[PDB]
Design an enzyme around this catalytic site. Structure first.
Site, PDB file in Angstrom:
ATOM      1  N   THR B  94       0.866  -1.164   0.000  1.00 12.28           N
ATOM      2  CA  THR B  94       0.000   0.000   0.000  1.00 12.28           C
ATOM      3  C   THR B  94       0.905   1.217   0.000  1.00 12.28           C
ATOM      4  O   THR B  94       1.581   1.501   0.996  1.00 12.28           O
ATOM      5  CB  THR B  94      -0.957  -0.014   1.205  1.00 12.28           C
ATOM      6  OG1 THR B  94      -1.830  -1.137   1.080  1.00 12.28           O
ATOM      7  CG2 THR B  94      -1.817   1.244   1.253  1.00 12.28           C
ATOM      8  N   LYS B 169      -8.252   2.115  -2.934  1.00 12.65           N
ATOM      9  CA  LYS B 169      -8.023   1.795  -1.539  1.00 12.65           C
ATOM     10  C   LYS B 169      -7.942   3.051  -0.664  1.00 12.65           C
ATOM     11  O   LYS B 169      -8.574   3.108   0.391  1.00 12.65           O
ATOM     12  CB  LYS B 169      -6.770   0.938  -1.344  1.00 12.65           C
ATOM     13  CG  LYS B 169      -6.584   0.539   0.101  1.00 12.65           C
ATOM     14  CD  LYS B 169      -5.455  -0.444   0.344  1.00 12.65           C
ATOM     15  CE  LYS B 169      -5.285  -0.594   1.851  1.00 12.65           C
ATOM     16  NZ  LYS B 169      -4.273  -1.612   2.203  1.00 12.65           N
ATOM     17  N   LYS B 244      -0.982   5.593   8.624  1.00 10.00           N
ATOM     18  CA  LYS B 244      -0.263   5.383   7.360  1.00 10.00           C
ATOM     19  C   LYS B 244      -1.164   5.641   6.144  1.00 10.00           C
ATOM     20  O   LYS B 244      -0.774   6.369   5.246  1.00 10.00           O
ATOM     21  CB  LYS B 244       0.294   3.970   7.273  1.00 10.00           C
ATOM     22  CG  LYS B 244       1.107   3.714   6.007  1.00 10.00           C
ATOM     23  CD  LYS B 244       1.343   2.232   5.778  1.00 10.00           C
ATOM     24  CE  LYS B 244       1.829   2.002   4.357  1.00 10.00           C
ATOM     25  NZ  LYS B 244       1.837   0.576   3.941  1.00 10.00           N
TER      26      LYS B 244
END
Ligand SMILES: C[C@@H](CCC(=O)O)C(=O)O
Ligand SMILES: C[C@@H](CCC(=O)O)C(=O)O
Lengths: 292, 291
Positions: B94, B169, B244
């Protein structure tokens, strides 16, 4: 059952028509002649003053714009009501105001509920309103046969004020979600991600909510959403702005910490100065007024 | 179809993902510079190598599961020349949309096929092979990749061109962060108003405000016994990880010039919360709203 319906506006008019259609004797008052005439056309016996409307009633329903007007209506009619009359306030007002008026009504030996509604004029006309109810379980049971012909759903939320509290908390969350969804669609588009792709992902993932699956603020993915019909309400910015004003009153009164709710409240207050008549999902197009 | 797969990054996600590939009959060639990680992966059947270039040398597919865009770029730079031409690279890390498109172009300039395929589901999803892969890149490349992703996946969704997996995402997780804060606010406000947690739960879940953050991740103990609030806010999805993702969302916002007022507010709230509560589930942000 004889019902006095005080407030025959855009919600009160169709609600009262459903009560007439369910076999109730409906007596009415509204200070707008056009509202009163429309209500009389569908079978409500309209009176010149609220105390008169209330005189022969087993149940008194209020659908009024503010807590101040609800309180004044209660002090105006309570002496006129018969003992153990059931008062139902379906107005959307502050928790504090709801509890004060509940206590006032019970001081007179009346039974009282707060029963604000969601679903709008469409839900009112279609008899699919969701009533969120505060008060005693036994009082709600008595009220149920009056509520049923107006309602798709009836939910007991707790003691007096809990109906107003539950609605206000939900609509504060909704306002935040509708803005967050809008931010997401604009970000996606600038990233080169199509609206349909983001829709497919979010609706199958943790971010899914009514704000996207039903109220999608970009045209295409949900053909029936306001975005495909020039943001016709639906649920107007004016009304969302009103509910957030009450959420902010609740926040001020409790000393609560609600940073995103309060930010949403600011966003919608500013948006309502220009686009009060649009569906609240139209907030997608005001995000660059926020640009810093 | 049974294939030789190099798996770079054998940590909390990488190790269980690679075990499912071994279980599906693939030959898995692993590298991780933390020997503890590599040892665990070896125990479940991964052939562990001395270096990333060695693991890559004889692979049809190269999967990366790495902590940052910088590490992905660093890895690609170290291994692309070692891979056989037209090897398929899948980055399931990611990372920022910008980083994803940079490493995608880098891979293609070396003659390699590349997809971004970041995942949701965490370690539990990884072990059970119920991860959702959100995929960016060519449709034909995804076609080639499917038999490799299937044994790790509950869902595979094609999002668009390179970077679109990361984009989808980061948009979803920004929304989630905002929703989790808003649900926390509602529950605390409800408590100050005398509305019970159970009552608010019943109402919101039956109304327009319903979302995963309440129906699955309810931030107050009681209404959803399986939620982190009932287990001392043990993750779940840690505040460290949400912080994050919000960092990546703010990178996307900065790179596009988008305006995301609530998403950025949520990023600031989680950045502060993560300073001292990184190890708690992200629903634990509710603690900041109580005195
Ligand atoms: C199903 C509904 C009955 C009232 C109505 O549907 O008219 C309810 O129980 O709230
Ligand atoms: C999720 C993937 C199948 C693989 C699996 O269930 O492990 C698919 O259905 O596309």
């Amino acid at each position: 059952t004889t019902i006095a319906f005080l407030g025959l506006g855009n919600m009160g008019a169709p609600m009262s028509a459903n009560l007439v259609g369910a076999g109730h004797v409906v007596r009415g008052f509204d200070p707008a002649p056009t509202a009163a005439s429309g209500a009389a056309a569908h079978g409500v016996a309209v009176f010149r003053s609220a105390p008169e409307a209330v005189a022969e009633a087993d149940v008194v329903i209020t659908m009024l714009p503010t807590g101040e007007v609800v309180r004044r209506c209660y002090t105006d009619v309570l002496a006129a009501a018969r003992p153990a009359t059931l008062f139902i306030d379906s107005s959307t007002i502050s928790v504090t105001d709801a509890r004060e008026v509940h206590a006032l009504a019970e001081s007179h030996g009346m039974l009282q509920l707060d029963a604000p509604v969601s679903g709008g004029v469409k839900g009112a006309a279609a008899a699919t309103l969701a009533f969120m109810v505060g008060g005693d379980e036994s009082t709600l049971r008595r009220a149920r046969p009056v509520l049923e012909p107006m309602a798709g759903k009836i939910i007991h939320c707790g003691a007096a004020g809990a109906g107003q509290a539950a609605k206000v908390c939900n609509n504060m969350v909704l306002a935040v979600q509708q803005i967050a969804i809008a931010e997401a669609f604009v970000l996606a588009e600038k990233l080169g991600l199509s609206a349909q792709s983001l829709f497919d992902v979010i609706t199958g993932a943790t971010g899914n909510c009514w704000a996207v699956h039903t109220n999608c603020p970009v045209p295409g993915p949900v053909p029936t959403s306001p975005a495909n019909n020039d943001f016709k309400p639906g649920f107007s910015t004016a009304l969302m702005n009103k509910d957030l004003g009450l959420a902010m009153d609740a926040v001020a009164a409790t000393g609560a910490t609600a940073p995103l709710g309060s930010h949403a409240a600011d966003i919608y207050a500013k948006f309502a100065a220009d686009h009060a008549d649009l569906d609240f999902s139209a907030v997608i197009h005001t995000l660059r007024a926020r640009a810093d």
